[PDB]
Design a protein around this ligand. Structure first.
Ligand SMILES: [Zn+2]
Ligand SMILES: [Zn+2]
Ligand SMILES: [Zn+2]
Ligand SMILES: [Zn+2]
Lengths: 1131, 67, 117
RNA sequence: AUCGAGAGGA
């Protein structure tokens, strides 16, 4: 029955495999989008108010149902056809499906003359579709079906195709809503502040933040204030309580202080009462609120109405926005004050801003919902204006012409295309970085980009606290994978078994709590709240309970049985403070864990047995979760959980550590993400090395996707001979690194050989490189289109001619065909022409606008595709193919942060060799190891020697006590090798033995995208910028290198004044001006007629020539634009 | 994508051994014994056969450009 | 000394503020909303414990013994019920510097005795 | 071509 330790390493990984058979790696994206389409769009459409318009006749126009068909495309003839994602990629279409809404317009004029007209399936917009979602044409297709459609079966999906560009929505971090968080700002007028970003269940407005603060000590005592929304002045809490109908001080403290035996709380609230005694009735308090507001009505009536509306709608919407909710709002605001007092009295800890239990991940669904709310509101507005301008004339109108569908369509398309998350007009208030271009450089880069999280703290911020690896990231975020540049700690990555909750309605839970012995908050007396336990659901205090323990037992039983409580519902019992917080909302990152009985796992051997035959008896992960054996625990419920790292922790020990565990890790290696799960032996490296590899696995070459032959990507690198690593971890089985690997096993020798590998460099074998070692192919796609925008000027693909075309370069166009397009198989060098495009003029009647190769490439045309774009003019894509043979300067890396460029390449006779004539493919310098402490590199090399000599794949899973260095060495000594991986090598040049026995063996190396040929650049009098006549910027522009301020300072320190003048004047922008010797302002010179005159001074004899930079002339002219007179006085 | 022709290290021909290697593996050989049957004694050539991923078999799941 | 609690009027249920009656030279507690008055019984109006000599045993609740994440010990039996097992934990409360002190709670149900060594 | 944004390198 029990899984014994000897079977555990199989059982756990069997369980893990079942998880990845059920979910995958992009499950969060697909589930978010599916919830958005199934629920969020319908909720948004129904939550909009019916637009009642009347001059008389009236019309309501109620939207009642939505229909999202499959993705289709409409040609110029208008025939709807099912559009495949690959066709969208090739034709630069948007993989979107039409959204139709049912509309009901009832005519009501008078005399009960009512009649309803329903417009079924009114086309309301087009919604882009996430690939492999339920509403994707690739849904449920087999691998054969996907290959029939020219799709990769290993492609995870989880992205959109907007204008042929694959866009991926990055999950955005945000502070959780409807939760009270008591912080303390050191530099502020308030000692403690308790904030609550409140938002109603079905979002319709932004988060309304309410603060309840305490004024810092230094009138008599510490005063509690409340910064309500839409009010620009602090308001005493007692005033707010009275404005809600609680005038008696006893009632207010009944709502705030639940234990009247506690004078400390009492004296700390007393200043607030003493400050609010002149105001003692609800109307006066409402008048005070309205007066403190930023729109103080001259008459107290409208002041009181405004205060009523604010306190009913903007104050704590999550508690309830309807009327008669003042009791719930009073109880909740009293809870906020109670929490603030507990913090000020030291009875509760301040809340941690960085705790991921306090955060939420805004995924594709809830982000598209924000867009859709804004866009549907704008659409209903436009419909209101259109219908109003017609009914004002007293006649009917056609809603089909009122609905301008471009709002929703173009809005979603623009937002996903650019990443600016918001309305196109508010292009600066909008937050960019959402919806990035999917990284297709290697399969690991694609997976990681699809599992990418973002902390929008702002890269400019230099506070390290949000960048720090918090304790609560354990199991939810990769500890290693993070960019090492300016976004350290802000851009994160999901751990492998991390699941972001999609969201759920609290209705069944609330109903069960009602049927259960919970007492509502309006029905109780406050005297009961002392000993009772509060119950919050999605931040709303809904009631109280008397035995929280057996309530938690009941709820956990219900969730483990897949009863009314779904698996993703978090249920935290804080014991010391008697809250029970239940969460069903979306964005809660959680992970699966094995539940533990008294001191035993519930995962018995029968579950492993049924999981082994997963493909026959359809016993899956969901059956494991439904059995009550596995549980999803979120960051906030982990605080109440006692984990076992392994079932070995559940053994009874000579001194028991815990003996009351509640859960167990499925495997600790699941704390790593996609790119860190490729590192072998990451627990033997320094952690920065693991981070650098997690970044560098994403630039590694491989086969980024199986269907690369049909993709017209702008840039693509494919390795000739990708190999799976000889030394692998058990997590790559689910990353599909074995099916799409990104490196080669290289016989690497760590040695000092000729000095060409010093300081992070490598010596490669020229003979190996000749045999296809780390050879790659680079595919570059050029796009072009001939626009017939108007009869004024039209472009067209056609072989240009020297007699008709004007802007025709001296490059030869013979490689083009009569259609103007080069043919595949044609070898093209730099500056060559691949598309001959000519544009009609207003060298006559047509000008050359041909597409050249990006300079200095020298490839062969791989293929040419011709089609029609969305509007329907001819559209061409040409993929050119360039074989990249590794060379000096190309960057290579192992899986341990050990990067370096090729210093030199030696032939096989020049490389050092073992007694059996094995030469290293790569030689790396021993000095790269000691400071870096990448012992995982050495253990991987030794394990790889054992694996190659044994005919197996080494197990480098991080935390594995069945694999240590002594075992690997003992294994290697059985194959006739030195147990530590050393060998006697001979000098290739002289054949003499090397005195020091070299450490050599197979290690998995990666070829990175950074090849020297894509970086080398030179300039000598090339093109210049228009504004300031200085060299351009970039290799692509043939630009010059920037001689910056620091270079100026260095050369000033050198004392090299002529070199400094050459760099900053003569090699950048030499220029001449003519200055009036009297006024010092630039004069008018006419060198052809030799007439120089200053219009200002009315002189034409006292002019002087001045040699100045063009940028300085431009500066002085831009100062004269500002009415400044910079007078260059030559005397 | 396809089995290399030569071993990158020594230059021994491994191109003619992939199919035989697979046939030995379905014959219930261990990978080590299979590599021994094909005469790959240096761990470089054993690396070549043992770490190869036949991606061409997946690229042949797509219909060609011309019928 | 001990703290002093707030007391409310019997008519308006607002807090009673302190006042002095010169006629009898006696402390009274009177409401500044209604016209109620009361004869005080403590004679103390304000108390500040600067030292903050708070007995944290009063802040503990027996329910904490149900926490699986707290450590348990068999070495400190309960003086009230004789149960062997007991959870222990530190103060973890602000304004307490010498907070390495351990507080124990009996894990027996319905006993919930709390103490300190 | 410009501008902006994003992703990256040292
Ligand atoms: Zn002048
Ligand atoms: Zn070889
Ligand atoms: Zn009174
Ligand atoms: Zn006891």
């Amino acid at each position: 029955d029990e899984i014994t330790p000897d079977l555990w390493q199989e059982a756990c990984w069997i369980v893990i495999s079942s998880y990845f058979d059920e979910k995958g790696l992009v499950r969060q994206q697909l589930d978010s989008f599916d919830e958005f389409i199934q629920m969020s769009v319908q909720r948004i459409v129904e939550d909009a108010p019916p637009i009642d318009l009347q001059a008389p006749p009236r019309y309501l126009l109620k939207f009642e149902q939505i229909y999202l068909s499959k993705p289709t495309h409409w040609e110029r003839d208008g025939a709807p056809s099912p559009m495949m994602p690959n066709e969208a990629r090739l034709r630069n279409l948007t993989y979107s499906a039409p959204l139709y809404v049912d509309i009901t317009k009832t005519v009501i004029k008078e005399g009960e003359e009512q009649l309803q007209t329903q417009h079924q399936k009114t086309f309301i917009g087009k919604i882009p579709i996430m690939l492999r979602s339920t509403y994707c044409l690739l849904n449920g297709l087999t691998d054969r079906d996907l290959c029939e459609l020219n799709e990769c079966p290993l492609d995870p999906g989880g992205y959109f195709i907007i204008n042929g560009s694959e866009k991926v929505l990055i999950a955005q971090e945000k502070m959780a809503t409807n939760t009270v968080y008591v912080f303390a700002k050191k530099d502020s007028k308030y000692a403690y502040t308790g904030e609550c970003r409140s938002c109603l269940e079905n979002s319709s407005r932004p988060t309304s933040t309410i603060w309840v603060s305490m004024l810092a000590r230094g009138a008599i005592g510490q005063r509690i204030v409340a910064t309500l929304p839409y009010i620009k002045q602090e308001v005493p809490i007692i005033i707010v309580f009275r404005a809600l109908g609680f005038v008696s001080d006893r009632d207010i403290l009944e709502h705030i202080i639940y234990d009247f035996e506690d004078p400390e709380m009492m004296e700390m609230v007393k200043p607030s009462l003493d400050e609010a005694f002149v105001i003692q009735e609800q109307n006066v308090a409402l008048n005070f609120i309205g007066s403190r507001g930023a729109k103080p009505g001259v008459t107290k009536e409208k002041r009181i109405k405004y205060a009523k509306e604010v306190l009913q709608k903007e104050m704590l919407p999550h508690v309830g926005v309807s009327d008669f909710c003042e009791t719930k709002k009073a109880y909740f605001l009293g809870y906020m004050v109670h929490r603030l007092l507990l913090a000020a009295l030291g009875r509760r800890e301040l809340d941690d801003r960085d705790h991921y239990g306090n955060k939420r991940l805004d995924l594709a669904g809830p982000l598209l919902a924000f867009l859709f709310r804004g866009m549907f509101k704008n659409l209903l507005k436009e419909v209101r204006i259109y219908a109003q301008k017609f009914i004002d004339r007293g006649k009917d109108f056609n809603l089909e012409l009122a609905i301008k569908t471009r709002i929703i369509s173009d809005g979603l398309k623009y937002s996903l295309a650019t990443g600016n998350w918001g309305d196109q007009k508010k292009a600066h208030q909008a937050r960019a970085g959402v919806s990035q271009v999917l990284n297709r450089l290697t399969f690991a880069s694609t997976l990681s980009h699809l599992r990418r999280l973002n902390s929008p703290i702002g890269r400019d911020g230099k506070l390290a606290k949000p960048r720090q690896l918090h304790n609560t990231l354990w199991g939810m975020v990769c500890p290693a994978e993070t960019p090492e540049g300016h976004a350290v700690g802000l851009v994160k990555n999901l751990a492998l078994m991390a699941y972001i909750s999609v969201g759920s309605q609290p209705s069944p839970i609330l109903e069960f709590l009602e049927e259960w012995s919970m007492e509502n908050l309006e029905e109780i007396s406050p005297a009961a709240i002392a000993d009772a336990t509060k119950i919050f659901v999605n931040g709303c205090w809904v009631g109280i309970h008397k035995d929280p323990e057996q309530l938690m037992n009941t709820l956990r039983k219900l969730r483990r049985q897949m009863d009314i409580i779904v698996s993703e519902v978090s249920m935290i019992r804080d014991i010391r403070e008697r809250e029970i917080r239940i969460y069903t909302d979306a964005g809660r990152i959680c992970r699966p864990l094995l539940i533990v009985e008294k001191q035993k796992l519930l995962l018995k051997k029968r579950h492993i047995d049924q999981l082994k035959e997963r493909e026959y008896n359809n016993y899956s992960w969901q059956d494991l979760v439904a059995s009550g054996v596995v549980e999803y625990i979120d960051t906030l419920e982990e605080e109440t959980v006692m984990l076992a790292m392994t079932p070995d922790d559940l053994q009874e020990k000579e001194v028991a550590y815990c003996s009351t565990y509640t859960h167990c890790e499925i495997h600790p290696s699941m704390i790593l993400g996609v790119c860190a799960s490729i590192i072998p032996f990451p627990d033997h490296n320094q952690s920065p090395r693991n981070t650098y590899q997690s970044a560098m696995g994403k630039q590694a070459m491989g086969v980024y996707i199986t269907n690369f032959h049909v993709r017209m990507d702008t840039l693509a690198h494919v390795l000739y001979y990708p190999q799976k690593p000889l030394v692998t971890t058990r997590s790559m089985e689910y990353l599909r690194f074995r099916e799409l690997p990104a490196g080669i096993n290289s016989i690497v020798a760590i040695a000092s050989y000729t000095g060409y590998n010093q300081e992070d460099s490598v010596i490669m074998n020229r003979s190996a490189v000749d045999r296809g070692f780390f050879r790659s192919v680079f595919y570059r796609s050029y796009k072009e289109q001939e626009s017939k925008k108007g009869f004024d000027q039209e472009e067209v693909f056609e072989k240009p001619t020297r007699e008709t075309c004007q802007g025709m370069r001296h490059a030869i166009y013979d490689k083009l065909d009569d259609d103007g397009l080069i043919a595949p198989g044609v070898r093209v060098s730099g500056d060559d022409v691949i598309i001959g495009k000519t544009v009609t003029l207003p060298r006559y009647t047509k000008r050359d606008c041909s597409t050249f190769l990006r300079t200095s490439e020298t490839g062969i045309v791989d293929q040419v595709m011709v089609t029609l774009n969305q509007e329907g003019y001819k559209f061409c894509k040409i993929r050119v193919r360039s074989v990249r043979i590794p060379q000096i300067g190309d960057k290579f890396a192992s899986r341990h942060g050990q990067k370096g460029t090729c210093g030199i390449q030696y032939r096989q006779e020049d490389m050092p060799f073992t007694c059996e004539g094995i030469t290293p493919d790569i030689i790396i310098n021993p000095h790269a190891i000691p400071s870096r402490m990448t012992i995982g590199h050495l253990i991987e090399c030794l394990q790889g020697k054992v694996s190659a000599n044994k005919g197996e794949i080494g197990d480098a899973t991080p935390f594995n006590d069945a694999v240590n260095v002594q075992k690997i060495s003992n294994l290697l000594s059985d194959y006739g090798y030195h147990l530590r991986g050393n060998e006697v090598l001979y000098n290739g040049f002289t054949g003499r033995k090397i005195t020091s026995q070299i450490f050599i063996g197979p290690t998995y190396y990666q070829r990175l995208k950074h090849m020297v040929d894509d970086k080398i650049h030179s300039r000598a009098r090339g093109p210049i910028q228009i504004l300031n006549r200085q060299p351009m910027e970039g290799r692509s522009r043939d630009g010059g290198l920037r001689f910056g301020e620091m270079e100026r300072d260095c050369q000033i320190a050198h004392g090299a004044a002529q070199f400094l003048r050459e760099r900053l004047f003569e090699a950048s922008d030499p220029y001449q001006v003519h200055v009036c010797n009297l006024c010092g302002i630039m004069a008018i010179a006419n060198t052809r007629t030799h007439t120089y005159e200053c219009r200002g001074c009315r002189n034409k004899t006292q002019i002087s020539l001045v040699r100045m930079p063009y940028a300085c002339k431009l500066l002085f002219q831009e100062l004269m634009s500002m009415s400044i007179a910079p007078r260059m006085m030559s005397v | 994508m396809i089995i290399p022709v030569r071993c990158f290290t020594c230059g021994k021909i491994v191109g003619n051994k992939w199919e035989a290697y697979l046939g030995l593996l379905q014959a219930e050989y261990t990978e080590g014994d299979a590599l021994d049957a094909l005469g790959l004694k240096r761990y470089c050539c054993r690396r070549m056969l043992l770490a190869h991923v036949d991606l061409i078999e997946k690229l042949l799941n797509y219909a060609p450009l011309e019928k | 000394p001990g703290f002093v609690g707030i007391r409310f009027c019997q008519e308006c249920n607002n807090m009673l503020y302190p006042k002095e009656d010169k006629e009898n030279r006696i402390l009274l507690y009177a409401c500044r909303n209604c016209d109620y008055q009361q004869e005080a019984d403590n004679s103390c109006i304000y108390v500040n414990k600067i030292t903050h000599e708070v007995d944290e045993l009063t802040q503990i609740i027996a329910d904490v013994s149900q926490d699986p994440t707290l450590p348990r010990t068999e070495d400190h039996p309960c003086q009230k019920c004789g149960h062997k097992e007991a959870v222990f934990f530190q103060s973890h409360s602000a304004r307490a510097e010498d907070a390495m002190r351990l507080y124990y709670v009996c894990t027996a149900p319905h006993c919930g005795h709390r103490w300190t060594e």
